[PDB]
Nucleic acid binder design. Sequence first.
DNA 1: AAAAAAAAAAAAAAAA
DNA 2: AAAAAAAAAAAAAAAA
RNA 3: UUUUUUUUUUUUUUUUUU
RNA 4: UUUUUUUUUUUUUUUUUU
Lengths: 418, 418, 473, 473
Amino acid sequence: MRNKIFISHATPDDNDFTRWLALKLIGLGYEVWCDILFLDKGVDFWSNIEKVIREDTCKFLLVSSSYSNQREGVLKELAVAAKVKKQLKDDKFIIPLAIDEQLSYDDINIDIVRLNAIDFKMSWARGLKDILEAFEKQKVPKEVADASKSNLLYQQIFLHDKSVIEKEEIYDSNWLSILSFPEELRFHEYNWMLPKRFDVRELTFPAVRYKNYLCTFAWAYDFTYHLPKTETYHKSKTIRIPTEEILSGSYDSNFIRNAECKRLIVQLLNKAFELRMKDKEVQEYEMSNKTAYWLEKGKLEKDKFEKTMLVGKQKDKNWHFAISGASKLYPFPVLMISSHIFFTADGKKLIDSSSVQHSSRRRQGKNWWNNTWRTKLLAFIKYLSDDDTSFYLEMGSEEKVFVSNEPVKFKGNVSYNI
Amino acid sequence: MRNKIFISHATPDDNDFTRWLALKLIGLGYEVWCDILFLDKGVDFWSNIEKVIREDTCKFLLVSSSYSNQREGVLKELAVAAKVKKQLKDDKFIIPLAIDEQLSYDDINIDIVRLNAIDFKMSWARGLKDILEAFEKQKVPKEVADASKSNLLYQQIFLHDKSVIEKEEIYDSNWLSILSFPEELRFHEYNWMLPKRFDVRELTFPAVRYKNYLCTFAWAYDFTYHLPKTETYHKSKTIRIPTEEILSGSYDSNFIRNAECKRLIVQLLNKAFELRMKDKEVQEYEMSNKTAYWLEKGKLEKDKFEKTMLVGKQKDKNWHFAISGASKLYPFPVLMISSHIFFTADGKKLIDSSSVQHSSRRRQGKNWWNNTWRTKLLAFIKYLSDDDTSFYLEMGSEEKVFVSNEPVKFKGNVSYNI
Amino acid sequence: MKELIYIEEPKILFAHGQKCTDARDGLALFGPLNNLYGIKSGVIGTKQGLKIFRDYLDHIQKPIYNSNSITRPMFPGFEAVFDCKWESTGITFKEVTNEDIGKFLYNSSTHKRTYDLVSLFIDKIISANKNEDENVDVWFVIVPDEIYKYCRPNSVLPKEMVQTTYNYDAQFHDQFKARLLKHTIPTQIFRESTLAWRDFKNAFGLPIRDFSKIEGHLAWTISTAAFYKAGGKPWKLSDVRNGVCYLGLVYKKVEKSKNPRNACCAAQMFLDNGDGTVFKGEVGPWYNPKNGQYHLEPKEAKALLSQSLQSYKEQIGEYPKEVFIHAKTRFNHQEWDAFLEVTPKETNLVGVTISKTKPLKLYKTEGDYTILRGNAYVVNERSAFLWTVGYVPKIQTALSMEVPNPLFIEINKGEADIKQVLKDILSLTKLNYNACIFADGEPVTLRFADKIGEILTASTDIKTPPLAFKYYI
Amino acid sequence: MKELIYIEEPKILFAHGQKCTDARDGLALFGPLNNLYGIKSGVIGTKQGLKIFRDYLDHIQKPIYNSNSITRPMFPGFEAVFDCKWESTGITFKEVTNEDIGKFLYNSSTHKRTYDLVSLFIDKIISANKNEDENVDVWFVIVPDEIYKYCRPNSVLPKEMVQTTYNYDAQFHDQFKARLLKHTIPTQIFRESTLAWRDFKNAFGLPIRDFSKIEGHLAWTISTAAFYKAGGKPWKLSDVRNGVCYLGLVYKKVEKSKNPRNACCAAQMFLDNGDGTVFKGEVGPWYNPKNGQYHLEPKEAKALLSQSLQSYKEQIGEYPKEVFIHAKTRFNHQEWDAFLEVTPKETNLVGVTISKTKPLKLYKTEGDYTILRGNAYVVNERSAFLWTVGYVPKIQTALSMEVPNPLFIEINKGEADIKQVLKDILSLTKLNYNACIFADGEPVTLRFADKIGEILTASTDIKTPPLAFKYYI
DNA sequence: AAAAAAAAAAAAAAAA
DNA sequence: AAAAAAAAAAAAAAAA
RNA sequence: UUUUUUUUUUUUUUUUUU
RNA sequence: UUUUUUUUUUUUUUUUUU
């Protein structure tokens, strides 16, 4: 018996409306057959369409549109449907569907101008309800209404060619591993031997004043230049502490809290990072809270590192790749890094207007996608490297910390394709 | 050409739905032909229906109902419509309309069981919209939608057999004309000659004390019995006033205001009315503000006056027709009357419970229509009459007022028929 | 030979500009003026009471046949007449346990129990408005019959069933609608007796409220009230001239405060630019000292009339040309001096009094039927009698049961043509949006003003009350 | 070898019980959960602005094609998707002359001019609610662009065009929505730039807001917002367990009063008896002294949690079995002591913090695209990172432009299984009824709590504010 | 008056 | 403390 | 404010050290 | 209070007179 539906349309142009109509007709309990309904094609669909129209199709639905009005394939299935119309002796067989307002009823195909069409130009819901009312009027065979099949075929056909897939992928990060730390942290007994109204930022190596003890990893007599009074300190007065257990967190005393002891470490790391990048002779821009460092035009060969560009030219303003480093010890010992972009009018003086700087940065980032960001970040990190596999932060005469020049690798089991 | 509509129905039973359907189809712009559409009938409609179906009818509409399912006339027009169906070669000609929920699709006529029917059992609006959608589907001829013809035929056919008509009718009222008044109103100079702490209600003739002057229409020496001191009054001290100009309202003085002078008249008339009905020896019931007077059982022959009943028997309680009189001088000189009904358990003592009295009065009035009310009111008015054409109120030895026993006649130019 | 004149029946407009004397017929054939897409009805009350409400709603979803079609047109269904579908699905229901009524109804103090029940409903309905994402157009609150007969004044609670505020009045419906004014929630009070009464029987075994012969009429009027509350306009007028404001004054008593204080209220009706009409209450309630004055001082007279003239002006733009002040008590010169002071020269102020006190009764020669509705007995140029209640051919039955009582129309002040004022009252007797009736026995301005005054006299904390009839009738 | 785990995409339910990951697709095919019969939209603003609103409305009455269908589904029309028809006819319009803006906008004082404009709109909309018999579901208020750029703080009025309160804030939209809370009127603020922008051009001759490629998306989101405001539920969840209340805590500043006072607000979501879900704000705003505390005292903690537990109980009947307190700042023991005091033993209280502060950024080996939305880096049993923003295949484009920033989920107190809490946040990122988006970059409880706090910090006279989102978003 | 971890209000712009 | 010409609140009932 | 996202501006507070 | 209508109960005030 005939219980299937044929819907003719322009596949490259009328995909949306045909898909919606097929989905709703299936959900309402009708066996819908369409070209876009099935995923994959063979040489046999040319005969398949004709045999379906001749034997299994009980009724023809045509998507009337400017693209589908005069399409050779559309006209050929229209002719097959029309001949089936003649041999079936069923007047209510061809049901055209006009969905284009630009296609007037006086410009439709000759085989359609004499057939009543359901109006979809104004309201699609009204057209669908008219289709329904006509269909229950014509006693067309149907099954129990069930949208489960609708959603089913929705997943297997639509959105199936591109979705989530399972495959392992390697991932990087802006986190930088720290290879090593000094064996012990030194608190030196200075008291008057260090002036009370003295700032520790200008001192050579990083050092922070906690209570009366100077917090640094360096040797006691390393601060002779900035502190001439420090020539006669007794190293036995140091309360040097095994930093390894500080990282483990096992240490605890009334003298210092482990959270507070770890508090002093990150500030020392930040000061060492700032001092090291000062040693690299790189300029700086003042941020609201942090400090960002960029490169001039001429410091690098062609203002580029490796095969990667780091400083470019845009109209009359020079954009410079910049970084900002923060030391965090909670998840892992990591010198965290961030990406920032700043502009210079001549390449040596920074623009003092914040609004134009922000506008230029966002304009340059508008077209900046994934790969360029990673390339420039990794290039700058490799530029600041002291060795092939790591770079060190100078914060003592014999005390050093090694930080990997390679960002922290991560592994993800789920990815996709373009 | 065929552009008319046939609607078959059970005229004595399915009038409402058929009328509504015809009215709406006409309003939407369709030429509707129906039996109830035309007002008046002849011998020729038997041929008219057949000729309309054969020539002018383009389509058959059937009102499917329990009353119209197996009606010989309905079946004969169904057969004519069906034969027209065959010779016209139009499959969508018969459109049955099922409007009864008690008539299942398995009990409809044989010629209808094979034809799809539009469901009116649940929602009439849904059925009408389905009729429409099918009709625009079938390209049925139509005119421009216009409800003016609908409302037009609504007035000429429906509600036309009974409406407002113009013809003079005579009318009566509860107003009673007053034929005459005394020529002058007397204010007597009593002062100490009438005791200050004396009530005037118990005095024989009506009289009201205004300032120091006694307001009455009677002669000065008529009050000797209740006022023995009044034997030596000088009639020259009276300030008698021409009541005719009081009614005209022309009189005015600082002594008395015309509105206040007219104020004293109505109280005197009310007192005279009360005294006269006391003279008639009729009992009274105390109302909230007024006083109502009724008749016993036995005072009248068969407790009836003329050919009219005035006191009747109902279960164990005796209802009595009662009246209340008010004198009003603003529109016309009229002794206004009202109708009140009271009940007595034995016919001589009134029931002291107000709730049961009200319930009995409303129960007896429930079936009391127009004519009985007028008959009893006019009968009581004729009973209280002193002469054939008028009755008088005794309010002076030689001073009397004549009030017509016939209520005020009115004329109306508009009336109708049952 | 005194003559009686009859005024032609006023014509009320419907959708698509057609006219019909009977509101029911015109609404049935032509539908309401505006298109309402749907009514989201909210139901609150007993869970058992929900079943009766659903049964009545899906009963009126179907056509209803009354006893006699010629006397009263049948009810065909809400969607067929109103072009708006309104089913039992999608209704927002909040459950009210019968125990909650049990704690508060079974209270010795009448006012305390009334306040308790009113609060028990009002707090829940306010929480419904302010808590659920669902939108509700109008609220159908259902209360039992025991509460109805034991939540009103003069109702003595039987001692055997007594189990256990004064600032508010014991009138349940009026207080219920007054406390909702601050939140502007259109609500409708029902009893299940007014609902499908067939469950209830008397001692004899018959329904107490036998509505079988009137079921179509009750469905008609309930549907009309629900549609009007939903924000729809059932019908409008066509014979009212442009630039004509009316106003309707009614005085009511306030017992909660010392001295009755004679609260005064007003309702306003006029026309708009084009064809639209406005029929809204215009109430600024003006209290009047002294026990039985019923005459408000010139200051509040100026306030009232200035407010009315403004509310006309911001809607039209120009002052009304003639104003027919309607009230059912006469006025002295005290109000009229101030009224003339505040009115401009162009405005023609007219004051008309309506009275049922006069017991004028007409008597026909023969027949068991009453007089036409519309006859006028012109006493003089200033006074006349109008019989707006009685028999009209279209409804086949007299609007009254006993002999009708006419309206006493007298123009207290101004000049006024008597024919026009006796013609406007007959037109005004049709705007009873609260009840689907052919006509009303008094101008609706007086009736609706009395209703709004009764509602506004139930609460003393009301400030700037709403003045649309959706929250009142 | 650290491992990355991905949570399956949450499923949100639609009408007739079908499920779809994308809200837009599921709403298009299956429609909204409840049936709304119609939307009576009210329009107030400039008479010229009415034309643009009507043009946009009858534009969206028709299907709209966007730039790329695979990236964003096209907009097919309001009635096709929502099963609710909403046309330009039947809209209630109140005219606002541009001169009225001219008097008040052209004012030197920013706060005074903002209050003047807000009052000029609010008094008219209140009069519209309380005067016309017409019923309005939601109000579409239209304001020009000159007002928009000169009715907010930090907006300097140019001297050449200056022609001519402090208790309220200059934030126009927030104050406008706050002053409407007393009357509970769902309203929507628009600018004609957000409307049909094709009229406006920049100095170059191009529209300032080029929305041609996004027209379908803007129509989708505007239709979704209008439907939600009208009292409809677009979609609901299916993966949330029964007996699970969440609550979302956000702290906001109040500048009108001395000291910021740290106003605190909350939003609540849970399940009902059966399948229904409730997503409503639960705000009792609790002010916190001291400038920068952000930690509320135990008394207000007890008040808040007792109110939330009650509002759960009267809707379900039994206390929630586990509560996942959501906030984007951590808590100290001061609140938790009181919280444990008020909770019963059966309830399992859990506190979760969400932070965007941590600049953890992931880097893929190759490609110009970002990470999946749903990956979780489990730091330990107590802390994890969730990338709710980024690329998802169904929308073909990364939800962000630069490298996404993940959410820092840490269970401050309680025990909590990490997988479940990292699974609930991903589900909660879908309930953005204010914007038809595939997903949101944070749990909607935090976002909507922030929104309601911003609205409630604009007015100081608010008492018992409404707690339904219709009047807020 | 500094130091780092934590804090919200505000503006500018781009695509979704 | 009356008179009448007016005043509103309240309950009881029957049909519309 | 149809949005969402990504930044740039400031300001603030706590724990602690002088 | 879906109504409407018709009553019966009370009470009250004003203008006026002692």
